[PDB]
Each structure stands twice: as C-alpha cells, then as structure tokens.
C-alpha cells in the first residue's frame, strides 16, 4: 500500500549492482547491517555457532551466497525452510586475453557470451564494463579483490550493420606497467582504466573477471504504470524478493525463541547448467545445513530426517502471457502481471507426480492472502530435490522477454514476491504439519 | 511347475493397481502382512531398529518405496544385496487445470503425456481415470490422501480421425462445491465423480494427481499360451518379480540368525530421467542403508566399506527379439521369451569395462539353475553405481513393444524373474566372496 | 426408456460373432426363431412362396443375407421398403498358404489386410482367430462348413517396435495329418488347433477362410456413460439396427393382412468396392424381389413399376464430429452422438439433385418422433439406386474413428437406430404416397 515501490528500490539495486560480484556484495552489506554474522567457509564453525543459534551468512567464490537463521530450539524434525534462487545473468564477458589489434584505428576487445548464443537484442545497447579485479599491492603477498564498475559510462557497444560479427567498438607502456601479469593479455588503455576505478596500479593487477552489461537504468512503465522495464531480471528478481523477505522476517525473530531453520541460498551458473562448485550442484545449501547442525548441538543430527521434513522453494522466473504470441501459451496455465507468484508445473520434469507441494503453496497463499498463478509449458529445483531428498516446489515471479537484455514484469510484482516469500518463512512449518506423513 | 502362474497374479496386480500410488500401496499391504514394519522417513529410526535387526519398509511421496531385511549379525564387510527398479510407467496425466469448455456439446479435459511424446498406440484405447486425491475433511486441519480408480469404467479416450489433436472426449454448482480449492480448475462433473469414489465431498478436495490409463485387463496369449499381453509392463514387471522374490526369501529368514542386509528399492520418475527426490538420484536406497546401519549398532559404520562389498541389480527391461525387425537387433545379443533374465550390455555405458558383474550373475544362475540372456544394443544403474561406488549390474526381463500402451513378454517370464531374483538374495554374498579383491 | 440397452445386446453380438460368417449365422438363428423361413437360393421358389406371402430369408456365400416380408395383398404399385447395409468389416486375413518358417524360434503366419492398407491402430491389440472351415468327414462325399472362434484366447498380435513389418507372433505330423489337403499350406499346430475347435480331424479339413480380429469386448464408456466403444462398428452397427428393427416390426405383422413388401439385405465386400457376387453389385436384393414376385402370383409383375414405387435406405455409417479436428468438418453439417440417424449428403455423389428422398426421411422422423442429422463432406447406395431405378437415400448411425480397430458411437445410438428403422418400415409407404408422381 504505497510501499509497493520497493520497485524503485529494486531498480536502484539492479542499476548499482551490475555483476554477480556486486549483487552478492550488496546482499552481504544488507545482511550484516541486519545483524547477520559472516562465517568463512574456509574455517570450521563449531566455535562460531552456539546453543542460541543465530543469524549468519557465508559466501563461496564471491558469487554464491547462503544466508540462514538457526533457532535455539531447532531440531531435525522441524526441517529447513529453503528458498533457492540464482544471481548469475546473461552477459558478455571479456575474454582472458581480450586483446585485438586496431581495425582501421578502431579499438576492440575479444569477448564471449555467457549463458547463451546471444541475441540481436544485444545490438546497439549502451554497455558498461565491470566486475572483479584481483590485485597484489606492491611489496605484499596478499591477493585481494576489488569491484569495478564504469556506470554510467558506456565504454562500448556491439553494432548492427545498417565471435566474428558480434564484436565491439571501444600513451606508451611504462616499465612498471610491463611488469604486470596482465600486460600482454589486455590493451594498456583498458588496464589503465580498470586500475583507475579500483584505485590501484596497473602493475598490481593479477587477474580480472569483467562483464559487459546494459547501463540503461530500469523504469516503471506503461500508461497506468503497470510495468517495470529493467535488465538482468532473470533471476535477480526472485533473488531480491527472497532476500528482502528473509530480512523482513528476521526483524521479528529472536533466535532464542525460535525452533526454525530458515535460509535463502543464491547460486551462480544456473544459465550454464548448474554443474559448478558455485552452482546448485556444488551443494552450498547442504553444506550450510550439515555444518550448522553439527556446530550447533553436541547431539548427533540425522540429516535425512531434516530433509524429509524440509520444503525448498526453487525460485526461478516463469513466462508472462505475451499477448502477441497466444499460441505458444497453454490456456488456463499462463500468468498475468501484478497478480502474484507463479507455480511452474511441467508434465515431464521433477514436480510431475508431486501434488503435495502444489497443495502446500496454495494453502500458504490462502493463509497469507496471496494469489497463486499456474504455468504449464540444469534447473536448480530438480538438482536440489534429488540432492537433499526434500520436497521441492518450482515457482517464481513471471516476466516477459526473458533472456532479453531488457525484460519486463509487473510494477507490483517485486512487492507481491516479497509478500509471498515473507509469508512462506512465517507459515510453511505450520502448513506442512497438516500434511503429516505425506 | 504349474505355479508359473503367478502370471495371473501379475495380471491381476497390474489390473487392480493402475497408478504408481496404487502399486506402492499394494506392496505396502503385501509387505506388512509378511511382517515387515513400516518406518516413517520423517522420524529418526534409532529406537525403531535394534540389535536384532528386522524386516522393514519406508515410503517417499507414495511413489518411492524401499523394503529391507537387516540381519542381527550384519557388518560393513558383508555389504548390501540390492535390487533397484522403477514403478512409474508411461501415462497421460490430468493437467493441474484440466478444464476445457465444451466443443459442440462434447466434454473434454486438458492432459499431458508423462514420460514421452505419446504414440498413435494410445489412440482408440479405453482409458480409466485414477490416482491420488488430497482432501481435508470438514472442521479438520489434516490433509489426508485417498486413492481413486474408475476401473472397469473407461471414462474417456483419445480418438483417431477416420496437445491439439491428442485431446479427449469425456447439475449446477452447489454453494459448498464452489468453496472447494479445485472449483475453477476442474469441471464440476469430474470433481463430483472423483469425490464419490473417494467417499468425500467436493468441498473437501484439496488437490489431485490423476492418470489416464488403459483399463483393458492383461491376458495370457498365443496359440500355445506362450505370451502375456498387458499394459504398464515397464517396469512394473521387474518391480513385481523383485518384490515377490524378496518376500519369498524373507519367509525363510529369521533376522536373528542372519548376517545379510537385503533390499528391493522401487523408484519413481525413471521415464523422466530420475533426477527427482523420488527418483534414483534422490538417494532413498543410500538413505535407508545409512539410517539402518546408524540406528542398528552403537559402533560406527564405514559406509564406503559397505558399498565396496555390495552388489546392486539395476533391474530394468530389455528388448525381446521382434522377428518382424531383425536388422535393429545384434546377432548373438538378443533375448527370446520364456528362457530367463536378460543382461543389458552396452559398449558405451556404465557396464563397459566391468566384466566382474557379468561373471557374478552367470555364476549365480549356474548355481541356482537359471538361464541368462544377453542384449547388446537417466537409467538408474549408472546413477546408483556412481552414487554408491558399489558394483552394479544392469539386467531385466525382456519384453516386446516397450513403451507401447500394451506390451508383451513370455508367460513364464514373471516366474523365471522371481526365480532368478530369489536365487540372487540367497547366493550373491557367497558367490561374490570368490571374486575376493576384484 | 431403460431399454436403450440394447447396447449390451449389441456389444454381446459383436463379441460373440467376430467374422461375417458368424454375423450372418447369428441373424439366421434370430430370423428363424421369429418364424422367418429359409429359402435356398439354389432352388426355385415357386412352390415355397404362395398366395399368403410370408416371412423369408435367403443366404449367398454365408456372407450375404436377405430377409423379407411379402404381403398377401402386395402389388407392383406398392413397391418395396428396403434397408441395405454391409456386414463385412476391416480385418486381417490368414493367407491361403499362411506358412512361415521359424524366426529364431518364433512362430508366424502370412496374413493380408482386408479392406485397407491397415493402421498403426492394429498394432499391439489382442487378436483372436476365427471364421469358416470347409471339411469332409471320413468316408463321405459332402463338403460341410463349420464356424470356428478362439475368443477369448488371443492367439496372436502384430507388434510395434519399441507384409514385412506387419507380421505376427503366434508334435510331429501324423500320417493321417499329411493326408489333409491343407498339410503344406498351414503349420500343423494351427491346423490342429482349428480342427479341435470345429470338432473334426486335421485330415478332414478341405479349406479355410479365417480372420484375425480384436478380442477386446466392447464397453459402455464416458463419465456419464454417453459412449459405446467396440470393434467392427462399420457397418455391423447399422446392420444390427436394421435387422432388429425388421424383426420388431415383423412381430405385429400377419402377412395375410399386409399389402407391403419389406426387406433388410446385408452385403459382403463393401470395403472392397462391392463388385463381387456377394456385394451390392451382385444383385441379391433384385434377385429376391424378382423371384418372390414371380413365385407369389400367377399374374405377371412389372418390376419397373415396383422399383419406381420403392424406397431404398442405403444404411452406412457417417462421421461423428471429432472435437479434436474441427477443420475437416463442415459447420451445420456434422452429427453429434445420442441424437439420431444421420443423412449423408454429398454435392457430388448420387443424392445430389434428389431433394425428395431427403424430404421423405424428414417427414418420417417427424411422424415417428425421431431426429435427423446432416453430414455434408463403391458405396452401395449409388449401386442399388442405378441397379433398381428406385429412389435411394444414404444415411446411417454416425461414429468416431471409423476404420479403426476400435470405434466409438453414442450409447443411445443403437436404440435410436432401431427406433428410426422400425418407424421406416411402419410408415414409408404412407409418407411416400403424398409425394405422388415425384
């Protein structure tokens, strides 16, 4: 009510955090200012998690984040309430050696598509450069990370004609600059430019993982302002909604009076099939849960009983009804904007032969005043379901023109998404109890 | 000998138990009247399994069942004797919203194929409706399950012309009926009909997972009665044979005088690639074994040693020689009916480079008086083998016209299958001992 | 009213009488227990038909039957009320030499499709064997006929792969057995099997004309039981309805108080184009009428005047609206189930330019309380019309999936068909009188 924007907050979030690194870093800052404590995955957690439980988060690779709330009174039979989503998006990436010699004076860079064989939709769009630099300051032996972002400067673009065709229109090297490990691999100007943004010298740059992304800020749109146009909606839209839902929920939770175990886990490499250590199949969720339950109590914890009592919402976007292409959609099985969360059903696929998860989500929405929509036609749901043995439901916030460089969704859909996910954390355990043995 | 029918018992079993729900439920009743004890997967088993071991079974989702016999004197070095098979079959499923408005007075329903893009073989067949309903009785807060089956009434059929073409030819709503969660999603008549079968009100129906299946009862066939014609043979044929084998074997087992760990595990979603929590990759088998060995003894159990000493028969059907298509078959590598179990060999595939499993099965058959046949050309064998590290052999009972709505096999093949599997449980440990380190 | 089953009687009739031989034999038994007298076509009828007229039937080839009621007071100007239909159906036939040598131990038989190049619809269906055997008992010189039927035993099936491809999966010869004329032509087991069914020796078998047919019994179907699923509906459905109509009508007829000449004639070989001596072009109808009118009175009978005053209903099935394929059907010219008889209209074809027959059928239905449906898009109507000169109307009971091995129609359609045809015999003469010269 007037606070369904929130859509502006989302638009600012996509605009200010273009790469996966930025998104994870942004959530890290948001979590710890809500008193979630960072745990290194490289250290054992026995002495970091106690009888009281608490609020925590861990990070793998700077692109895979898990945030969790563990109750003082949690036990195996309570299970875990999980929302799983992905934070990688389709982009163009600077190649390891991005160096191209001039084409009639034009400066260019070797780049590769990430997550697809990219569209004509990427042509004639203003593209910023940004992501992660690795560097070693002089007279040190620590390799540190810096985040870099050219916004609002579009440093390049893939021109249409009015890795041969899709290429990009973008003084002498100092002795020190030649000492850099990246000297031959990237043109000196680009290196000088990223070095400037990070606040380090060119000679100190070890490596980089840079994207090219649309710098056009998102907008509320439509004559009645029913829509939201923005880049990278898949699946930063569900990720944002789930994380904000968890943090709003965490507000009213003293972990000492809780018997729940709740988590939002955000994965990398969904666009690539998820079979990486930062992806859904790398098992960060399962790692978090086993570690937490191990560190938390002296008693042994039966993980099979934990997962048998758990519910995983595998949150990934569905397709809005495109009124221009009615034939691809199935009648009575397509979502519309500004209504509510969409349940992905597929006759083949992991949720066929599981009517219970569908029923549970319907009951939740009923209790919380939400609406649910249907959509029948390396996704993380099947991976997580089979990896844990826990009942998993595929759903999400529907959008138009998915895997476009600029997608569309309802202007109320971020808020409705946060609302549904907030309701899930509050009620899933109670609602799942009445299915009993099922 | 006269008791190789058993084929009638099988025919009655397929006829009376059309969906996966019915099949699992049927086995649950058979097991517990043979004194197997049900364990909830949602409860820890420490205090349900003791020093004596025992006979048990557990169920996941109503479609994934594991039955096991744990010996009082079992130890890691004995391993597990496993038969793994699947109970899902190709069917048509009622869509989540099955509602179609009338086509010139004809009533119809939206349905989807499960496990394939379905055949012309499904045209002009009498189709019953059946499966699982979820319901909540009035003034309650328990969601219960009921099984429903229209047999012998064919409620519908997919007509040939003498999800556009393959669709199906099948008073006013009470206020109470409109109160049902499924009111808009399925036509009132269908809801009234399934409600009647379950013995509940329409208003009490929460959700349903219904199939459409062939109601034509199986028959012994051929002029010399050499064949068995029936629906859903893949892989309810191996599942039946393996379960009956285990139960016949269990008869002569006092668990107090046993040092063996035996199981038949039945999976869902093999036709869909097995990557679901109810499928082979959901790890019910491994869950059962870890839980049992944990609960059973105070000593710690090395699971790697258990699997290194185990044998898994991954039981799935092979192809009978179709004399009409000799060229697709490979000479000296095709099974015939009424001879015995068929070993699936594949030069690429998980049993290439493992001659030991083949040798073991041959030795077993030799000892038990069985015959073995060969067949070289998300299967569960590779999944289970890699998931456990245990030596796994793909084999099964061969059939004709697999993935037809009505398949064929030997009339003696159910009995021979039970015979072979019964021999396996009796002798595998002894036979595998002489391979020693291999 | 409660007696619109009648659908069960029809289902039992198709089930118990699989071949044309069985169907004709069945009608022969029904007719003569309703006091119709058999006339041999090989004997002159002068002294078998008298001044009183009577109820009669004759048979050609065991597959072509004519039943008629001749009134004592009949005259040329009264004409004949004719229903013409066919009793042959699409089947597979055993070839004259059905012998195939074993294919890896499998027994097989050479067969040919009758009436089409047969469907994938014939694959994986349980097939019985049955039809006519000719035999000569030992020390005799009479060649007799026996009917044979394996129902409910499916002796074979045409397998799908999971006259090359469509072929069929099915001790030493006695000296006497080698003496049979069919010894080399059919495998000894099949011959022994059919000999057993007939109650004769193998050595006594002269010849056989055997079909392979679906042994699946028909069912009432649909959630509201609106449908009838059964094999061989075309055109045993109209044949049954017409014959039962005649017999119900014959009940209230003393031939001594009648001035009508009524007949139902059932033809063979409609699926083959009708140009056989047992088909519509073999002229059994015309033969019956000329013979009867010759034998019946001493006065000469003008046959041209008889036919000029006659009405022939050429009863053959039309197509039900298949809601899955709306585009093949013509709006306002397609029948629905459980409504009534369907009039076949075709802008090209023999009923174009004859509006009078259509009008007469409409008037009949009006008088008898029937409903009439339309269907615009070697048929017997054109043959009979041109052969007699008599006004002929094409109509019938509509069905789905015609020329499938299992077709569908209304559950009320047999009864409505009998009702319409019964009304026709009662009123055609009276209704046709008001068209006068037309």
From Swiss-Prot, chains A, B, C:
One of its GO terms (biological process) is cytoplasm to vacuole targeting by the Cvt pathway. GO terms for cellular component: Cvt complex; cytoplasm; fungal-type vacuole. Binds 2 Zn(2+) ions per subunit. The average amount of Zn(2+) bound at physiological metal concentrations will be lower than stoichiometric. This is Vacuolar aminopeptidase 1. It is an enzyme of class 3 (hydrolase). Glycans are attached at residues 61, 64. Substrate binds at residues 270, 316, 319. Zn(2+) 1 binds at residues 86, 234, 270-271, 316. One of its GO terms (molecular function) is identical protein binding. Strongly and specifically activated by Cl(-) and Br(-), which act as positive allosteric effectors. Inactivated by metal-chelating agents. Present with 5730 molecules/cell in log phase SD medium. The keyword Transport applies. It is found in: Vacuole. It catalyses: Release of an N-terminal amino acid, preferably a neutral or hydrophobic one, from a polypeptide. Aminoacyl-arylamides are poor substrates. Homododecamer. The precursor form of aminopeptidase 1 (prApe1) assembles into dodecamers and further aggregates into higher multimers (the Ape1 complex) in the cytoplasm. The Ape1 complex is disaggregated in the vacuolar lumen, but mature aminopeptidase 1 (mApe1) retains its dodecameric form. Dodecamer assembly in the cytoplasm is essential for formation of an enzymatically active complex. If cytoplasmic homododecamerization of prApe1 is disturbed in mutants, homododecamers of mApe1 will form in the vacuole, but they are enzymatically inactive. Interacts with ATG19. Resident vacuolar enzyme that catalyzes the removal of amino acids from the N-terminus of peptides and proteins. Also acts as the major cargo protein of the cytoplasm-to-vacuole targeting (Cvt) pathway. The precursor form of aminopeptidase 1 (prApe1) assembles into dodecamers and the propeptide mediates the aggregation of dodecamers into higher multimers. The multimers are then recognized via the propeptide by their receptor ATG19, and ATG19 further interacts with ATG11, which tethers the APE1-ATG19 complex to the pre-autophagosomal structure (PAS). It holds the Pfam family Peptidase_M18. Its EC number is 3.4.11.22. The modification Phosphoserine is found at residue 287. Keywords: Aminopeptidase, Glycoprotein, Hydrolase, Metal-binding, Metalloprotease, Phosphoprotein, Protease, Protein transport, Transport, Vacuole, Zinc, Zymogen.
